[PDB]
Design a protein around this ligand. Structure first.
Ligand code: CER
Ligand code: CER
Lengths: 344, 326
């Protein structure tokens, strides 16, 4: 019985992948030292960062590193991984939450740094922690059609400023319990960068394939996590509850269009908000925790770069084998949920 | 290779309610003009911007985008439940996270199948959004899309006027800040759809993009932008079959009178085919193109079969040109 494609991508591949770890370690121990007088005033006796969220350290750049710089570093590395020159790139999309300016796009800045040709289409996509997958999909649609041969999706995140300003606000003798709780999640963020070269499959026959997938939304929850360059406010309790509800809905669609059954997937690359959010997600879908790589403990939450960083690390660690079915899953502020598949 | 089954179901624009005239602005800049001895009316007499519009206090980009979206849905005569994709393309944004699109979508009440995200690409983003939506429609992923764009400039005016008025500022710093006083508020939205759902609707053919990202760092913008546009037009001739005398309207990004005339001169375009709103509304960023297209529609200037060129030269530098057949 002939079936449809369900609109999954055909002949779109991952030619190259890379990540950059930011150089400076900031431990939760140091942060707690700074916060301790405020913890004490507020009666907080548990280590909410280390023991509850499960984050022991995160990485930071120098103050003067912009999103575009981190993105450029990852892009050069992914080009090497793909063994191609910048001249082959026909599309470059930046997907980071961090942004150099309102205008022009961070993508144009990265493109300028790398020296793209005058044929290269460039723009930014912004969608909280899901944007790298959005960028992959947009690239995939062009590649499938054959409008381009190769695309770069890039994402550099700089959390330096949010750390600096949040730590100042949270150490004020006047900070309220409500504002302290509201901003605490900002201290689980991390710096880092990732980039991916995608290509028409005919150019890279043995490369992993990207199939695309499904998305569902609950945009009535768009107030749950709001962030600017120096501040992020989060309702962690509702993010957890409403996020899981949305992912359940999304998983129903995934079973229908991707044919997913958790036991038949080899890796789950999940956006990571915290240890308890991850645990809840894994328990909710009955996923084998051994299939779920985490970097949150030592790098925290790298926003939309998280997924590709974890995928790149799995590649480098030699955890991925030909034929492996890899689920990319994320719940992003919006709320949105996306679930897609890569076949290694 | 061009899109065969993508149409424009509905289109709308919102004009911001408060007028700030350049005469009014100049009264405030006069002492600083005098100091440094300018004695020239750069806004009114050179740039050709005589007024621009501002929103009420505390109107966010999402609010303006939402107003435009509601009016575009009416123009398309469809309910929000039909929208499968909502992309926001504005420079102005409520937050870094979440997307301004999610906020607009929440305001409208989109369904749980509706995909949303922001695209940012200076003044070219609305055209990028249309392209992105077109590809999804063509592939059958969705039946209808909203592309929305609300621009706010209230804060920029307050801050810039105070800054450029301060003791430290050199000529040049000042002349650079003058450019900020050409920005205007406004909003637009477009419903795109699969053509079989809306026979007789205008059709979006798609377009071409060329870049010169070596210039991502005003007079310079002009020359290099036009050179980039020339390259892009050469491409448009080949892929779109474009020739100037065969196009009925040129809908272009709205930057300044000198910039517009230089563009018209370069391509040998009949200026009668180039509607402008900069004089009274200033530069509305990526919303300018769809606002002008919407005004052309509302004015009854567009007739069945009209070949309409949409184009912008954006910060990057980037240049995109696309065709709509009315
Ligand atoms: C398992 C439930 C998790 C809820 C997720 C909330 C969103 C996560 C964040 O707040 C950031 O990582 C980025 C983001 N919102 O996309
Ligand atoms: C006609 C030549 C145009 C040169 C380009 C000028 C830059 C224009 C602007 O500064 C804004 O309108 C928007 C933008 N840069 O995308």
């Amino acid at each position: 019985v002939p079936r449809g494609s369900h609109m999954l991508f055909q002949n779109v591949s991952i030619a190259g992948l890379a990540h950059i770890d930011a150089p400076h370690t900031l431990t939760s121990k140091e942060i707690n030292e700074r916060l301790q007088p405020t913890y004490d005033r507020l009666g907080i006796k548990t280590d909410v960062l280390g023991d509850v969220a499960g984050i022991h350290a995160r990485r930071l750049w120098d103050q003067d590193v912009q999103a575009s710089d981190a993105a450029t570093q990852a892009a050069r590395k992914a080009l090497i991984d793909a063994n191609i020159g910048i001249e082959k790139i026909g599309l470059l999309i930046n997907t980071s939450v961090s942004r150099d300016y309102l205008e022009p796009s961070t993508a144009s800045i990265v493109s300028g740094n790398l020296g793209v040709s005058d044929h290269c289409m460039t723009f930014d996509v912004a969608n909280a922690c899901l944007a790298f997958i959005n960028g992959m999909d947009i690239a995939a649609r062009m590649l499938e059609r054959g409008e381009i041969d190769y695309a770069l999706v890039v994402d550099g995140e700089t959390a330096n400023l949010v750390y600096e300003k949040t730590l100042e606000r949270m150490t004020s003798p006047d900070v309220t319990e409500e504002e302290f709780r509201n901003e605490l999640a900002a201290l689980t963020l991390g710096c880092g960068a990732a980039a991916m070269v995608m290509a028409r499959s005919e150019l890279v026959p043995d490369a992993p394939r990207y199939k695309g997938g499904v998305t569902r939304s609950a945009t009535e929850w768009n107030k749950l996590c709001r962030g600017n360059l120096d501040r992020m406010v989060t309702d962690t309790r509702l993010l957890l509850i409403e996020g899981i509800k949305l992912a359940q809905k999304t998983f129903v669609a995934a079973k229908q269009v991707l044919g997913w059954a958790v036991e038949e997937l080899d890796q789950f690359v999940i956006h990571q908000v915290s240890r308890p959010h991850t645990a809840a997600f894994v328990k909710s879908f009955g996923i084998d925790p051994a299939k779920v790589m985490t970097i949150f403990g030592e790098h925290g939450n790298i926003g939309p770069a998280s997924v590709p960083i974890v995928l790149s690390k799995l590649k480098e660690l030699g955890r991925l084998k030909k034929g492996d079915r890899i689920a990319l899953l994320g719940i992003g502020s919006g709320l949105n949920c996306s679930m897609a598949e890569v076949v290694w």
